[PDB]
CSV table of N, CA and C in Angstrom, one decimal:
chain,number,residue,atom,x,y,z
A,1,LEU,N,0.9,-1.2,0.0
A,1,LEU,CA,0.0,0.0,0.0
A,1,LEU,C,0.9,1.3,0.0
A,2,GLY,N,0.5,2.2,-0.8
A,2,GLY,CA,1.3,3.5,-0.9
A,2,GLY,C,2.7,3.1,-1.4
A,3,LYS,N,3.8,3.8,-0.9
A,3,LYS,CA,5.2,3.6,-1.3
A,3,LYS,C,5.4,4.3,-2.6
A,4,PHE,N,4.6,5.2,-3.0
A,4,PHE,CA,4.8,6.0,-4.2
A,4,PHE,C,6.3,6.4,-4.4
A,5,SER,N,7.0,6.5,-3.3
A,5,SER,CA,8.4,7.0,-3.4
A,5,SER,C,9.3,5.9,-4.2
A,6,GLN,N,8.8,4.8,-4.5
A,6,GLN,CA,9.5,3.8,-5.2
A,6,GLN,C,9.6,4.1,-6.7
A,7,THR,N,8.6,4.8,-7.2
A,7,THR,CA,8.6,5.2,-8.7
A,7,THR,C,8.4,6.7,-8.8
A,8,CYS,N,8.6,7.5,-7.8
A,8,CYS,CA,8.5,9.0,-8.0
A,8,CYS,C,9.7,9.7,-7.4
A,9,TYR,N,10.1,10.9,-7.9
A,9,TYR,CA,11.3,11.5,-7.5
A,9,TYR,C,11.1,13.1,-7.4
A,10,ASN,N,12.1,13.8,-6.9
A,10,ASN,CA,12.0,15.3,-6.8
A,10,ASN,C,10.7,15.6,-6.0
A,11,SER,N,10.3,14.8,-5.0
A,11,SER,CA,9.1,15.1,-4.3
A,11,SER,C,9.2,16.4,-3.5
A,12,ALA,N,8.1,17.1,-3.4
A,12,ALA,CA,8.2,18.4,-2.6
A,12,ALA,C,6.8,18.6,-1.9
A,13,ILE,N,6.9,19.3,-0.8
A,13,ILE,CA,5.6,19.6,0.0
A,13,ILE,C,5.5,21.1,0.3
A,14,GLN,N,4.3,21.7,0.0
A,14,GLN,CA,4.1,23.1,0.3
A,14,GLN,C,2.8,23.2,1.0
A,15,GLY,N,2.8,23.7,2.2
A,15,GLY,CA,1.5,23.8,3.0
A,15,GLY,C,0.9,22.4,3.2
A,16,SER,N,-0.2,22.1,2.6
A,16,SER,CA,-0.8,20.8,2.8
A,16,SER,C,-0.9,20.1,1.4
A,17,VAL,N,-0.4,20.7,0.4
A,17,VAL,CA,-0.4,20.1,-1.0
A,17,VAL,C,0.8,19.3,-1.3
A,18,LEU,N,0.6,18.0,-1.6
A,18,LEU,CA,1.8,17.1,-2.0
A,18,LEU,C,2.0,17.2,-3.5
A,19,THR,N,3.2,17.5,-3.9
A,19,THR,CA,3.5,17.6,-5.4
A,19,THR,C,4.7,16.7,-5.8
A,20,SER,N,4.6,15.9,-6.8
A,20,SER,CA,5.7,15.1,-7.1
A,20,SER,C,5.7,14.6,-8.6
A,21,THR,N,6.8,14.2,-9.1
A,21,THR,CA,6.8,13.7,-10.5
A,21,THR,C,6.8,12.2,-10.5
A,22,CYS,N,5.8,11.5,-11.1
A,22,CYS,CA,5.8,10.0,-11.0
A,22,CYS,C,5.8,9.4,-12.4
A,23,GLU,N,6.3,8.2,-12.5
A,23,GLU,CA,6.4,7.5,-13.8
A,23,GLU,C,5.0,6.9,-14.2
A,24,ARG,N,4.8,7.0,-15.5
A,24,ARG,CA,3.5,6.5,-16.1
A,24,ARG,C,3.7,5.0,-16.4
A,25,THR,N,2.6,4.3,-16.4
A,25,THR,CA,2.6,2.8,-16.7
A,25,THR,C,3.2,2.5,-18.1
A,26,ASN,N,2.8,3.3,-19.1
A,26,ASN,CA,3.4,3.0,-20.4
A,26,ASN,C,4.6,3.8,-20.7
A,27,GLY,N,5.4,4.0,-19.6
A,27,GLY,CA,6.7,4.8,-19.8
A,27,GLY,C,6.4,6.3,-19.9
A,28,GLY,N,7.3,7.1,-19.5
A,28,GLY,CA,7.1,8.6,-19.6
A,28,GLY,C,6.9,9.1,-18.1
A,29,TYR,N,7.0,10.4,-17.9
A,29,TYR,CA,6.8,10.9,-16.5
A,29,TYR,C,5.6,11.8,-16.4
A,30,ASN,N,4.9,11.7,-15.3
A,30,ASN,CA,3.6,12.6,-15.1
A,30,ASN,C,3.8,13.4,-13.8
A,31,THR,N,3.3,14.6,-13.8
A,31,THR,CA,3.4,15.5,-12.6
A,31,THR,C,2.0,15.9,-12.1
A,32,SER,N,1.8,15.7,-10.8
A,32,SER,CA,0.4,16.0,-10.3
A,32,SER,C,0.5,16.5,-8.9
A,33,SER,N,-0.6,17.0,-8.4
A,33,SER,CA,-0.7,17.5,-7.0
A,33,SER,C,-2.0,17.0,-6.3
A,34,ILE,N,-2.0,16.7,-5.0
A,34,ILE,CA,-3.2,16.3,-4.3
A,34,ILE,C,-3.2,16.9,-2.9
A,35,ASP,N,-4.3,17.2,-2.4
A,35,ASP,CA,-4.4,17.8,-1.0
A,35,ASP,C,-4.4,16.7,0.1
A,36,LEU,N,-3.5,16.6,0.9
A,36,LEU,CA,-3.5,15.6,2.0
A,36,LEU,C,-4.4,16.0,3.1
A,37,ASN,N,-5.0,17.2,3.0
A,37,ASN,CA,-5.8,17.7,4.1
A,37,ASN,C,-7.1,16.8,4.3
A,38,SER,N,-7.6,16.3,3.2
A,38,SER,CA,-8.8,15.4,3.3
A,38,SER,C,-8.5,14.0,3.9
A,39,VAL,N,-7.3,13.8,4.3
A,39,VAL,CA,-7.0,12.4,4.9
A,39,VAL,C,-6.1,12.5,6.1
A,40,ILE,N,-5.7,13.6,6.6
A,40,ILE,CA,-4.8,13.7,7.8
A,40,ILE,C,-5.5,14.6,8.9
A,41,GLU,N,-5.6,14.0,10.1
A,41,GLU,CA,-6.2,14.8,11.3
A,41,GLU,C,-5.2,14.9,12.4
A,42,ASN,N,-5.4,15.8,13.3
A,42,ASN,CA,-4.5,16.0,14.5
A,42,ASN,C,-5.1,15.3,15.7
A,43,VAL,N,-4.5,14.3,16.3
A,43,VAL,CA,-5.1,13.6,17.5
A,43,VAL,C,-4.3,13.9,18.7
A,44,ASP,N,-4.7,14.9,19.5
A,44,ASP,CA,-4.0,15.3,20.8
A,44,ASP,C,-2.5,15.4,20.6
A,45,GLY,N,-2.1,16.0,19.5
A,45,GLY,CA,-0.6,16.2,19.3
A,45,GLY,C,-0.1,15.4,18.1
A,46,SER,N,-0.7,14.4,17.6
A,46,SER,CA,-0.1,13.5,16.5
A,46,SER,C,-1.0,13.5,15.2
A,47,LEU,N,-0.4,13.6,14.1
A,47,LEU,CA,-1.2,13.5,12.8
A,47,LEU,C,-1.6,12.0,12.5
A,48,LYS,N,-2.8,11.8,12.3
A,48,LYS,CA,-3.3,10.4,12.0
A,48,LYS,C,-4.0,10.4,10.6
A,49,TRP,N,-4.1,9.2,10.1
A,49,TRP,CA,-4.8,9.1,8.7
A,49,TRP,C,-6.3,9.2,8.9
A,50,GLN,N,-6.8,10.4,8.9
A,50,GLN,CA,-8.3,10.7,9.1
A,50,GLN,C,-8.6,12.2,8.8
A,51,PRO,N,-9.6,12.5,8.0
A,51,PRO,CA,-9.9,13.9,7.7
A,51,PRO,C,-10.3,14.8,8.9
A,52,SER,N,-9.9,16.0,8.9
A,52,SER,CA,-10.3,16.9,10.0
A,52,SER,C,-9.6,18.3,9.8
A,53,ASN,N,-9.0,18.5,8.7
A,53,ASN,CA,-8.3,19.8,8.4
A,53,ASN,C,-7.1,20.0,9.4
A,54,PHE,N,-6.2,19.1,9.4
A,54,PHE,CA,-5.0,19.2,10.4
A,54,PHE,C,-4.3,20.5,10.2
A,55,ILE,N,-4.0,20.9,9.0
A,55,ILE,CA,-3.3,22.2,8.8
A,55,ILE,C,-4.0,23.3,9.6
A,56,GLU,N,-5.2,23.2,9.9
A,56,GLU,CA,-5.9,24.3,10.6
A,56,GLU,C,-5.2,24.4,12.0
A,57,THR,N,-4.8,23.3,12.6
A,57,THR,CA,-4.1,23.4,13.9
A,57,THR,C,-2.6,23.0,13.8
A,58,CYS,N,-2.0,23.0,12.7
A,58,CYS,CA,-0.6,22.6,12.5
A,58,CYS,C,0.1,23.6,11.6
A,59,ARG,N,1.4,23.7,11.8
A,59,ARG,CA,2.2,24.7,11.0
A,59,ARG,C,3.5,24.2,10.5
A,60,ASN,N,4.3,24.9,9.8
A,60,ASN,CA,5.6,24.5,9.4
A,60,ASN,C,5.6,23.1,8.8
A,61,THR,N,4.8,22.8,7.8
A,61,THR,CA,4.8,21.5,7.2
A,61,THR,C,5.9,21.4,6.2
A,62,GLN,N,6.7,20.3,6.3
A,62,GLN,CA,7.9,20.2,5.3
A,62,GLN,C,8.2,18.8,5.0
A,63,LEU,N,9.0,18.6,4.0
A,63,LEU,CA,9.4,17.2,3.6
A,63,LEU,C,10.5,16.7,4.4
A,64,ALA,N,10.4,15.6,5.1
A,64,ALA,CA,11.5,15.0,5.9
A,64,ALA,C,11.9,13.6,5.3
A,65,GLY,N,13.1,13.4,5.1
A,65,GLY,CA,13.5,12.1,4.6
A,65,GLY,C,13.0,11.8,3.2
A,66,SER,N,12.8,10.6,2.8
A,66,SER,CA,12.3,10.3,1.5
A,66,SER,C,10.7,10.2,1.5
A,67,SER,N,10.1,9.7,2.5
A,67,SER,CA,8.6,9.6,2.5
A,67,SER,C,8.0,10.1,3.8
A,68,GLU,N,8.8,10.7,4.7
A,68,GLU,CA,8.2,11.1,6.0
A,68,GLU,C,7.9,12.6,6.0
A,69,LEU,N,6.7,12.9,6.5
A,69,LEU,CA,6.3,14.4,6.6
A,69,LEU,C,6.4,14.8,8.1
A,70,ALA,N,7.2,15.8,8.3
A,70,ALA,CA,7.4,16.3,9.7
A,70,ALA,C,6.7,17.7,9.8
A,71,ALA,N,6.0,17.9,10.9
A,71,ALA,CA,5.3,19.2,11.1
A,71,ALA,C,5.2,19.5,12.6
A,72,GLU,N,4.7,20.6,13.0
A,72,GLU,CA,4.5,20.9,14.5
A,72,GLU,C,3.0,21.0,14.7
A,73,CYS,N,2.4,20.4,15.7
A,73,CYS,CA,0.9,20.5,15.9
A,73,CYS,C,0.6,20.8,17.4
A,74,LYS,N,-0.5,21.5,17.5
A,74,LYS,CA,-1.0,21.8,18.9
A,74,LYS,C,-1.5,20.6,19.7
A,75,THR,N,-1.1,20.5,20.9
A,75,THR,CA,-1.6,19.4,21.8
A,75,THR,C,-2.8,20.0,22.5
A,76,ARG,N,-3.5,19.1,23.3
A,76,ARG,CA,-4.6,19.6,24.0
A,76,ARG,C,-4.2,20.8,25.0
A,77,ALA,N,-2.9,20.9,25.3
A,77,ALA,CA,-2.5,22.0,26.2
A,77,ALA,C,-2.1,23.2,25.5
A,78,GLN,N,-2.4,23.3,24.2
A,78,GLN,CA,-2.0,24.6,23.4
A,78,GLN,C,-0.5,24.8,23.2
A,79,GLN,N,0.2,23.7,23.1
A,79,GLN,CA,1.7,23.9,23.0
A,79,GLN,C,2.2,23.2,21.7
A,80,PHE,N,3.0,23.8,20.8
A,80,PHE,CA,3.4,23.1,19.6
A,80,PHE,C,4.5,22.1,19.8
A,81,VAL,N,4.3,20.8,19.4
A,81,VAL,CA,5.3,19.8,19.6
A,81,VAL,C,5.7,19.1,18.3
A,82,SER,N,6.8,18.4,18.2
A,82,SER,CA,7.2,17.8,16.9
A,82,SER,C,6.3,16.6,16.6
A,83,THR,N,5.8,16.5,15.4
A,83,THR,CA,4.9,15.4,15.0
A,83,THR,C,5.4,14.8,13.6
A,84,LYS,N,5.1,13.6,13.3
A,84,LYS,CA,5.5,13.0,12.0
A,84,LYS,C,4.5,11.9,11.6
A,85,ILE,N,4.4,11.7,10.3
A,85,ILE,CA,3.5,10.6,9.7
A,85,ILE,C,4.2,10.0,8.5
A,86,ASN,N,4.0,8.7,8.3
A,86,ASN,CA,4.6,8.1,7.1
A,86,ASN,C,3.7,8.2,5.9
A,87,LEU,N,4.1,8.9,4.9
A,87,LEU,CA,3.2,9.1,3.6
A,87,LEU,C,3.1,7.8,2.9
A,88,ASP,N,4.1,6.9,3.1
A,88,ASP,CA,4.0,5.6,2.4
A,88,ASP,C,2.9,4.7,2.8
A,89,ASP,N,2.2,5.0,3.9
A,89,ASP,CA,1.1,4.1,4.4
A,89,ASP,C,-0.1,4.0,3.4
A,90,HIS,N,-0.4,5.2,2.8
A,90,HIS,CA,-1.7,5.1,1.9
A,90,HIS,C,-1.5,6.0,0.6
A,91,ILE,N,-0.4,6.8,0.5
A,91,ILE,CA,-0.2,7.6,-0.7
A,91,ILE,C,0.5,6.7,-1.8
A,92,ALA,N,-0.2,6.4,-2.8
A,92,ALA,CA,0.4,5.5,-3.9
A,92,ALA,C,0.4,6.2,-5.2
A,93,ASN,N,1.1,5.7,-6.2
A,93,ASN,CA,1.2,6.2,-7.6
A,93,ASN,C,0.5,5.3,-8.5
A,94,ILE,N,-0.6,5.7,-9.1
A,94,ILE,CA,-1.4,4.9,-10.0
A,94,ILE,C,-1.4,5.5,-11.4
A,95,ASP,N,-0.6,4.9,-12.3
A,95,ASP,CA,-0.5,5.4,-13.7
A,95,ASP,C,0.1,6.8,-13.7
A,96,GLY,N,1.0,7.1,-12.9
A,96,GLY,CA,1.7,8.4,-12.9
A,96,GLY,C,0.9,9.5,-12.2
A,97,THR,N,-0.2,9.1,-11.6
A,97,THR,CA,-1.1,10.1,-10.9
A,97,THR,C,-1.2,9.6,-9.4
A,98,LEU,N,-1.1,10.5,-8.5
A,98,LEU,CA,-1.2,10.1,-7.0
A,98,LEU,C,-2.6,9.9,-6.6
A,99,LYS,N,-2.9,8.9,-5.9
A,99,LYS,CA,-4.3,8.6,-5.4
A,99,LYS,C,-4.2,7.9,-4.1
A,100,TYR,N,-5.0,8.4,-3.1
A,100,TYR,CA,-5.0,7.8,-1.7
A,100,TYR,C,-5.7,6.4,-1.8
A,101,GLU,N,-5.3,5.4,-1.1
A,101,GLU,CA,-6.0,4.1,-1.2
A,101,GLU,C,-5.9,3.5,0.2
């Protein structure tokens, strides 16, 4: 499931939009963008795979490592702490286009 990093490169993240170049099934490269906001939520300090507009309570979203997304999110105590989530869990590349599964 996911692992789009196996056939995509030059991946970049801006705000909540994931943008990357992925290989097409019949050869060639395709470039597309998708909003991770509809699938990531903040649970008492940690980002989880569930919709809730996490960026509304999180800031400084950036690309960490090859497939890890690191950001800072508010805990129930109103303090920003370090949080991370594995994009490889559900973000996959289908025919050169990114699609959550």
